[PDB]
Amino acid sequence: MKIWSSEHVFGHPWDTVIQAAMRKYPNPMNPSVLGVDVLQRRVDGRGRLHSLELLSTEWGLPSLVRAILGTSTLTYIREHSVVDPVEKKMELCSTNITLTNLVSVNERLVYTPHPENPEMTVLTQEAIITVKGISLGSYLESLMANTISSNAKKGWAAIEWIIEH
Amino acid sequence: MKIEEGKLVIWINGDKGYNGLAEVGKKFEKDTGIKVTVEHPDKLEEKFPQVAATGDGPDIIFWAHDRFGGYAQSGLLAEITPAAAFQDKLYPFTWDAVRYNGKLIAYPIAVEALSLIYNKDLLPNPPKTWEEIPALDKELKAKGKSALMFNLQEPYFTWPLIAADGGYAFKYAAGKYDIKDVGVDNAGAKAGLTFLVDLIKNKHMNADTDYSIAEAAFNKGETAMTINGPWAWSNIDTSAVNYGVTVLPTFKGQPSKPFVGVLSAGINAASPNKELAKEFLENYLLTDEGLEAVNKDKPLGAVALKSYEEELAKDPRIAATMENAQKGEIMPNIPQMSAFWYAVRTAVINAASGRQTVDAALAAAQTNAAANSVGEACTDMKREYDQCFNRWFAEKFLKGDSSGDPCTDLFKRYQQCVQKAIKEKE
Ligand SMILES: OC[C@H]1O[C@H](O[C@H]2[C@H](O)[C@@H](O)[C@H](O)O[C@@H]2CO)[C@H](O)[C@@H](O)[C@@H]1O
């Protein structure tokens, strides 16, 4: 029931970083994301875009269990996103759909402008690994901490690769 | 547990010269006083991540380069750091086989390919083509012997026939393997398996034939030919048989394209003996004395080490391995290799047995190896959606504007493909 947190800062207005994050994947800064399928999009009473997206992934930590497990491959990610342009806030929760029962990994991202005003964006991140059969080990967890921290860091670079286009 | 410090533990396949490798280890311990243990666990290529991910496993893992990318992806392998003058002693295309993401993840040991191996007393003139082997078998079976026997359990052996008329693993271009494009269910892959399957279906081979059965028979003069690799020579040498190693045959006029392997030594990310394993591999293994010690046990193939390869490339057996190796491709090191090998393993065995027809088997293998986004069929409708939405999302939404979605029509059409897409899966 562990964590990995972060708070990155992007050097562009909130608008463009959100325009980016909404057309993020697939893209060359993260080739482990095979593609993103938007299953449902709704605007709510408050004017916030709700999307349900299902991602197709590769070498993320539910594949690290295929090591200890024995044999498998493709891992699917449920994602719910809400963007409120009035409140200037983008939220995003994700879970693994397949290769669960073993481990479940819950990420959560929030893009928002810097509280001091510099036309720059700050993203606040966390990942919640829970597992039944809680073996792990600090080594395996460090592996998981490391691979989480890379999709994280590749996700940002994926933004910059988009907003510089 | 955590690996043992002050000790080197080594995994290498049991069909390789491990008693020789053990003798390099002894030379190391005799010299450095650091004990070395050489084991050969079964299903080695699967068990290493199973324990090197928990911090366990061997200090040094010995396998073909094709598995080592999957390992580096999951950070199971330390990055190896030889100096410039040490990598000048190894052929640089072998290093190429162990560069993942521009990082070196293993020491290359030796280039391996499959060659044809035949009994000369039984058969003085080996078939130049697969399509003539049924006859060879019908004429030899009349003398109680048989034509061919090579190990159907591992797809490594039956692949150069599948690759012959145009099967491949993934498509290579632009410095990248396209993991989304897999040439295992094309015409020139169905045709090769259908031949093998027909060999079986016609009692010319046998679907149960594994490494041991095929090795036993060829060596005991029971079958005229085998397919196998350099490691296998030292048992025919110690057999009556007067063998020849030669170029593989051809299928539909095309040569057999073996998946070339580069036996590689990987250091474990979890090893507290990393500097001890560098010393072992660089200064005791990749020496002519080191490599000869191994190569005299079971032969290594064309070693990666230039100085020793000079004496080696004189062997007519090495020449024939290299003939076949140059008629095939180097295996890629990408993490999808295992899904590839598993799919082919399943397809061939299931076709060979009858549980699946050929087209069934390689259809299944198309999808199990492809790694496709669920809605790959509909990318063209998402592309024209996405353009509409990103335009709406930017201009009539992010800057406040009201009017409901102008992209509802394209969405629902794409929503239809992606909903049949999910249903045809899970
Ligand atoms: O059959 C699938 C395996 O193919 C190769 O394994 C070869 C290996 O390279 C060779 O040295 C060894 O002795 O024989 C096996 C076939 O049994 C790949 O390197 C493996 O990744 C595959 O599992």
From Swiss-Prot, chain A:
**Gene name of the encoded protein:** PRELID3A
Name the cystine pairs.
none
Query: In its UniProt entry, what is this protein called?
Result: PRELI domain containing protein 3A
Family of this protein = Belongs to the slowmo family.
UniProt effect for mutating V36A:
Impairs interaction with TRIAP1
| Superkingdom field | Eukaryota
What organism does the record attribute this protein to?
Homo sapiens
Q: Where in the cell is it found?
A: Mitochondrion
Please provide, alphabetically and separated by semicolons, the GO molecular function terms listed in this UniProt record: phosphatidic acid transfer activity
What does this gene product do?
Answer: In vitro, the TRIAP1:PRELID3A complex mediates the transfer of phosphatidic acid (PA) between liposomes and probably functions as a PA transporter across the mitochondrion intermembrane space. Phosphatidic acid import is required for cardiolipin (CL) synthesis in the mitochondrial inner membrane.
The biological process GO terms on file are:
phospholipid transport
Q: Where is the PRELI/MSF1 domain?
A: 1-165
Give any Gene Ontology cellular component. mitochondrial intermembrane space
Q: How does it assemble?
A: Interacts with TRIAP1.
PANTHER family linked: MSF1/PX19 RELATED
Q: Which UniProt keywords apply?
A: Lipid transport, Mitochondrion, Transport
Q: Where is this site: Important for interaction with TRIAP1?
A: V36, L49
Curated annotation (Swiss-Prot), chain B:
Q: What is this protein called in UniProt?
A: Maltose/maltodextrin-binding periplasmic protein
Supply one GO BP term. carbohydrate transport
Q: What does this gene product do?
A: Part of the ABC transporter complex MalEFGK involved in maltose/maltodextrin import. Binds maltose and higher maltodextrins such as maltotriose.
> Gene for this protein?
malE
Q: Where in the cell is it found?
A: Periplasm
- What is the native source organism of this protein? Escherichia coli (strain K12)
Identify the PROSITE patterns for this entry.
Answer: SBP_BACTERIAL_1 (PS01037)
InterPro entries xref list: Maltose/Cyclodextrin-bd, SBP, SBP_1_CS
The subunit structure is: The complex is composed of two ATP-binding proteins (MalK), two transmembrane proteins (MalG and MalF) and a solute-binding protein (MalE).
According to the UniProt entry, its GO molecular function terms are: carbohydrate transmembrane transporter activity; maltose binding
Gene3D superfamilies the UniProt entry points to = Periplasmic binding protein-like II (3.40.190.10)
Superkingdom in the source lineage: Bacteria
What coarse category fits the chief subcellular location reported for this protein? periplasm
A Pfam short name: SBP_bac_1
PANTHER family, per the entry: MALTOSE-BINDING PERIPLASMIC PROTEIN (PTHR30061), MALTOSE_MALTODEXTRIN-BINDING PERIPLASMIC PROTEIN (PTHR30061:SF50)
